């Protein structure tokens, strides 16, 4: 009666389709989580 | 008494320091008109009762903006000191289409070379266009319009007559001058010009129309029976409304640019004729369409001839109408359209005493008559040293090309490998370098440096020794 469908990704292998997005990709030009002060202390 | 026929017109970019460059006399047909007009406000008491008051008063309130118009024959000629083409009123064409100093050596607004005079509207973005002062002379009696702007320029393409422009515009204030501002006969035109120019009149009857549907590459073939086109800026003048003073205009603003025209033709059953155009539109009911149009006043020939060309790269066309002349006529209205609402690519014009059937095609393709279109490579023959089909270990196969058409913008080539891995070609020399570590087969490619992206290829075997 009802049919639900989603695109078949390369990473998900195979599993039952679902009524939501699963994965999210986040983009940025830079990392704010690491400071130069931390990374320098770590190397130093 | 001032007789109108004695009228002479001088225009200038300046009030003072007039010279042969900042100031220009122009010809006219005797249909000139000019003036300024008064608004006057009348008030009266509306009263009831048996014995009413009765009088009234009125006050002069303000002046309208001054208005002028005149018309001129189109007259392209060669500038005796430069060999460039110009028309005597080039300063008008600039003020129509610029907000900056006349810069006719440039490439926008009025500019020229030895092959043409050209106009393009690419720099029309100012709110006030470059203004002019007009010294209208009558016999022993000067007069002056301060700071005018060119509102409109009609071209009445009409099959029976010589090509004429009709101008109009508006200015702040008519000033009666007392005394000669400058020498009208030092700064006037001269008889060598007056006799050169009269070789260059343009006859409308020789007009050609070219048209093309960019949605199909189809090329209709359409004789005309009369038309028009018009350019206008929709200038507006702003005026105060102070009490206790006569208000006078204090500035102007610019409306939407417009470039439109009308064409009228007989209905012709010939293939690709107006009948087929009519059908193809009416059968199809597009909301938007894309026609290339070129209008060629004076026509084109293998001669060198006077000519004047309008080009509109993107015109929209209204659905044509039938009209019941005793021979069935049809009306086509068109408007130029920019590719984007921002861009100035509405269209462009070109004038010459000496265009040809080639230079016009150059102009329509490129916006100039002087250079050709950039022709592009059709074929690249790919060749190899002594026609060798293979390269050995410790060997390299030189490759070469022969490219057509030879007038393609550059017939040289850049090499690459299109398939296979046993060899890499030196992209500049075409020296196919075999990799000694593998044997196999590769397909070498060459691409023309004209930028066509057209290619040639040959298949080469990369091989061990005999």
């Amino acid at each position: 009666k009802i049919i639900v469908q989603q695109i078949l990704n390369i990473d998900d292998t195979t599993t039952t389709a679902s009524k939501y997005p699963k994965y999210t990709v986040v983009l940025g030009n830079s990392i704010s989580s690491i400071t130069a002060g931390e990374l320098t202390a770590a190397v130093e | 008494l001032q007789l109108l026929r004695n009228t002479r017109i001088f225009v200038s970019t300046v009030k003072t320091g007039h010279d042969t460059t900042n100031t220009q006399e122009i010809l006219v047909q005797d249909d000139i008109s000019w003036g300024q007009d008064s608004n006057s406000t009348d008030i009266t008491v509306n009263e009831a009762g048996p014995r009413p008051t009765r009088g009234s008063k009125r006050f002069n309130d303000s002046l309208n903006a001054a208005e002028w118009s005149f018309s001129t024959y189109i007259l392209p000629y060669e500038d005796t000191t430069t060999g460039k083409q110009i028309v005597p009123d080039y300063m008008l064409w600039h003020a129509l289409s610029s907000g900056k100093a006349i810069d006719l050596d440039g490439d926008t607004g009025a500019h020229n070379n030895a092959t043409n005079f050209m106009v393009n509207f690419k720099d029309n973005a100012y709110h006030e266009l470059a203004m002019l002062h007009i010294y209208i002379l009558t016999d022993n009696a000067w007069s002056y319009i301060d700071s005018c702007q060119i509102n409109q320029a009609e071209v009445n393409v009409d099959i029976e007559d010589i090509g004429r422009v009709t101008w109009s515009g508006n200015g702040n204030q008519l000033i009666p001058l007392d005394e000669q501002p400058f020498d009208p006969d030092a700064l006037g035109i001269d008889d060598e010009t007056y006799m050169t120019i009269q070789s260059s009149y343009i006859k409308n009857k020789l007009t050609i129309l070219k048209i093309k549907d960019m949605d199909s590459d189809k090329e209709y073939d359409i004789p005309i029976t009369g038309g028009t086109f018009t350019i206008n800026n929709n200038i507006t003048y702003l005026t105060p409304n102070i009490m206790s003073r006569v208000n006078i205009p204090i500035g102007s603003f610019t409306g939407a640019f417009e470039l439109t025209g009308s064409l009228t033709a007989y209905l012709n059953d010939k293939s690709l004729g107006s009948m087929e155009l009519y059908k193809d539109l009416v059968r199809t009911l597009k909301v938007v369409n894309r026609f290339e149009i070129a209008l060629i006043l004076g026509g084109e020939y293998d001669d060198e001839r006077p000519a004047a060309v309008l080009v509109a790269k993107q015109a929209h066309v209204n659905i044509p109408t039938i009209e019941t002349d005793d021979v069935l006529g049809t009306s086509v209205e068109f408007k130029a359209i920019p590719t984007d609402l921002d861009t100035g690519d509405e269209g462009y014009l070109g004038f010459s005493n000496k265009y040809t059937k080639t230079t016009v095609a150059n102009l329509i393709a490129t916006g100039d008559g002087a250079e050709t279109p950039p022709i592009l490579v059709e074929s690249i023959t790919v060749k190899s040293a002594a026609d060798a089909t293979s390269v050995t270990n410790s060997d390299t196969l030189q490759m070469s090309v022969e490219v057509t058409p030879p007038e393609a913008t550059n017939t040289a080539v850049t090499w690459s490998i299109s398939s296979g891995d046993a060899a890499t070609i030196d992209a500049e020399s075409g020296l196919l370098t075999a990799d000694v570590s593998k044997t196999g087969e590769v397909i070498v490619k060459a691409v023309a440096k004209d930028g066509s992206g057209v290619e040639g290829t040959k298949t080469i075997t990369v091989s061990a020794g005999e």
Partner: protein, 296 residues
């Protein structure tokens, strides 16, 4: 790159499908933000510069004007409004199991990825008339959240087709035709309220409405006629309000039926005497019916 309504497009998304209402005639929309503002006059310092913050998106109204289309896709508006459906037949259920109205989702699309997306919406009104003009259907919608977005879901087979040809209205009771019509006007409603959800947890966040509950439904109509009488002493066409009248209204392509109705009358001594009937269903009435028929 500017934008233009004359080439704008509207797409409705629901149930994981998308509806292209190609035959749009008009639409109107606003968007706004609510702000909190205080001027904090104080005898230490009679401050003149206000202190203020933006908190929430206003619930946008949306308004649409749509022509009737062969292929009938607009029937889904009644389906979303909450009529039950039986093929092309729609019915009001006499009592309803909903609490929340049917939520759905809207794209506004234009050239150059210049798109807008309205996330939670509900229909509040459908309204039209047969007044001697091409019948145009108005819709009132509300939406609780908006944002700008670069892309939209394609929709291409669920496109609203060609407009149906004109035809004249008829009104009747038990197959009696009614003399001297002037107009008929209909409205249907789904009155709702948003549940205000804002909390001190939302502080320093932008807030949206998220859920609403159905207050009421209405179906109602108006009819305008010229005043006429069969013979002077007649009683059937008097002013007095009839009740329990079965009433049927149709065009060639649309039919509406009230199995029993209550009629108010108002009379106007305009230059030709005019009568207005106000129509409403009775409490015992059966389900009002609506049908659509496609022209060949």
């Amino acid at each position: 790159y500017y934008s233009l309504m004359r080439e704008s497009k509207v797409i409705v998304e629901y149930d994981g499908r998308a509806f292209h209402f190609d035959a749009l005639s008009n639409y109107d929309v606003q968007t706004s933000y609510e702000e909190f503002k205080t001027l904090r006059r104080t005898i230490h310092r009679r401050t003149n510069y206000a202190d203020s913050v933006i908190n929430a998106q206003t619930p946008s109204s949306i308004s649409l004007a749509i022509n009737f289309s062969n292929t009938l896709t607009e029937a889904n508006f009644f389906e979303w409004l909450g009529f039950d459906r039986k093929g092309n037949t729609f019915l009001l259920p006499l009592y309803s199991n909903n609490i929340e109205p049917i939520m759905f989702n809207i794209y506004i699309v234009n050239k150059d990825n210049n798109c807008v997306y309205f996330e939670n919406c509900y229909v509040s009104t459908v309204d039209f008339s047969l007044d001697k003009n091409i019948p145009i259907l108005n819709v009132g919608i509300e939406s609780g959240k908006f944002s700008e977005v670069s892309t939209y879901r394609e929709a291409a087979s669920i496109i609203q087709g060609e407009a149906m040809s004109y035809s004249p209205v008829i009104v009747s009771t038990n197959g009696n035709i009614l003399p001297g019509l002037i107009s008929a006007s209909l409205s249907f409603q789904q009155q709702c309220s948003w549940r205000e959800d804002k909390s001190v947890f939302d502080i320093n966040k932008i807030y949206n409405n998220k859920r609403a509950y159905v207050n009421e439904m209405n179906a109602s109509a108006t009819i305008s006629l010229y005043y006429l009488k069969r013979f002077a002493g007649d009683m059937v066409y008097n002013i007095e309000p009839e009740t329990d009248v079965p009433l049927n209204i149709r065009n060639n392509n649309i039919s509406i039926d009230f199995p029993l109705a209550r009629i108010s009358k108002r009379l106007n001594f305009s230059d030709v005497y005019k009568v207005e009937w106000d129509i409403i269903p009775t409490a015992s009435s059966d389900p009002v019916r609506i049908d659509f028929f496609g022209e060949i």
